[PDB]
Design a protein around this ligand. Structure first.
Ligand SMILES: Nc1nc2c(ncn2[C@@H]2O[C@H](COP(=O)(O)OP(=O)(O)O)[C@@H](O)[C@H]2O)c(=O)[nH]1
Ligand SMILES: [Mg+2]
Length: 155
């Protein structure tokens, strides 16, 4: 391994953090209600720019990057991203990497959080922004890859 990157998923309940994490780690997905992923964390290896990188993912101070998830169909969860970053400022290495994720990009009929206005926000904060679908398996890997990229960039 070239690096070990320790990642962390924040966000409101029902956004899909557990779905994303299990999709990404295990390639599983179920509509079924997840109380908990049964295990303290997930481990996953990826290759990137010639570099083999192990990931250790939770669902604060020892995280290299934190992913702040929200739901494109829940405007409530989007507004709360604001709080979820103040948390990061309080309990996290001062330059810990950040990525904003609007899960459930697949529910377009239900989409109330305009991509363009979430993007405009992440930009305003200087953060990368991706829309994902744990259900369809869309952008899920782009997301974690983008996170590695950003961490490997500060180093
Ligand atoms: N349509 C769709 N539904 C999703 C997606 N991700 C999660 N869900 C559903 O939304 C619920 C919330 O997922 P969960 O991962 O437990 O959210 P968490 O509590 O924030 O970790 C689940 O019961 C899923 O069926 C997605 O990408 N697309
Ligand atoms: Mg969960």
């Amino acid at each position: 391994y070239d690096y070990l990157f320790k990642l962390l998923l924040i966000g409101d309940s029902g956004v899909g953090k557990s779905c994303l994490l299990l999709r990404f780690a295990d390639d599983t997905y179920t509509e079924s209600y997840i109380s908990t992923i049964g295990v303290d964390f997930k481990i996953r290896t990826i290759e990137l720019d010639g570099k083999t990188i192990k990931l250790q993912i939770w669902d604060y101070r020892g995280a290299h990057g934190i992913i702040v998830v929200y739901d494109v169909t829940d405007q409530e969860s989007f507004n709360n991203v604001k709080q979820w970053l103040q948390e990061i400022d309080r309990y996290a290495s001062e330059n810990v990497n950040k990525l904003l994720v609007g899960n459930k990009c697949d529910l377009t009929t239900k989409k109330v959080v305009d991509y363009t206005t979430a993007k405009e926000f992440a930009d305003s904060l200087g953060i990368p922004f991706l829309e994902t679908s744990a259900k369809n398996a869309t952008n899920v890997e782009q997301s974690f890859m983008t996170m590695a990229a950003e961490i490997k960039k500060r180093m």
